[PDB]
Amino acid sequence: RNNFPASSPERLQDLKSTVDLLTSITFFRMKVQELQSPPRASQVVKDCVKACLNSTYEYIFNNCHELYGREYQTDPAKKGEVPPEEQGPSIKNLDFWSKLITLIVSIIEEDKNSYTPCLNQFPQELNVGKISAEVMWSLFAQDMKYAMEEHDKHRLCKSADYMNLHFKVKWLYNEYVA
């Protein structure tokens, strides 16, 4: 994602030609070095994708505010380095989580939409949009569960706010994850 941003079709093509080169190397190992079980080009890449997705998740879960901030935030004064207790989870509000929901959506979209087509060489094995949705939800759901348990001890947001969050989460799961 960082090395071949979707915003550069040229680096998406160099990316495509890179995986064509990596198939060409796997094929050299298989055919010229005559190796019997060289690293399979789809699994090699799937690791790299999982890697890039997990780096994405870590970075979003730690920097939710800076990211949601700059990428969408409904108040320009809230785009910057909001406190770490609001770039990761807040006990005061549910807004970090509404923000994290939108981050997750956006990434799964870019993966589904720019990268799944760029990286079609193993289409059967490598739906970048699905690998994105799974990885990101998994990492999310853990974090969200602990958050809701933490809110429950403090009850600083109103009942209503958690009901609103429930409809958003209900929607999100029932969209991407289910």
Binding site: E58, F61, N62, G88, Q142, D143, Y146
Partner: protein
């Protein structure tokens, strides 16, 4: 059988397996209810047939039950903070 796993909760990182214990529900079929202190291991201990069934189930690498079974038996303590390999 119950498989009881202790894990360290780790946002940003990964939730590290601290340890694993197996309880056979054959025992409970007599006991009805049991208080027990399960000692935790680093990996589950196996015979040739467990290891044969496991290598067979791992070839069913699209069956979700097999995947989760294989994954679950193949869970071991992420070694660190107190050690890697157990005894059987």
């Amino acid at each position: 059988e119950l498989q009881v796993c202790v894990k360290d909760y780790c946002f940003a990182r990964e939730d590290r397996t601290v340890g694993l214990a197996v309880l056979q529900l054959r025992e409970l079929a007599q006991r009805g209810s049991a208080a027990c202190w399960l000692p935790l291991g680093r990996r589950i201990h196996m015979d040739d047939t467990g290891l044969t069934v496991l290598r067979i189930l791992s070839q069913r690498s699209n069956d979700e039950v097999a995947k989760e079974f294989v994954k679950l038996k193949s869970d071991t303590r992420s070694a660190e903070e107190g050690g890697a390999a157990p005894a059987p």
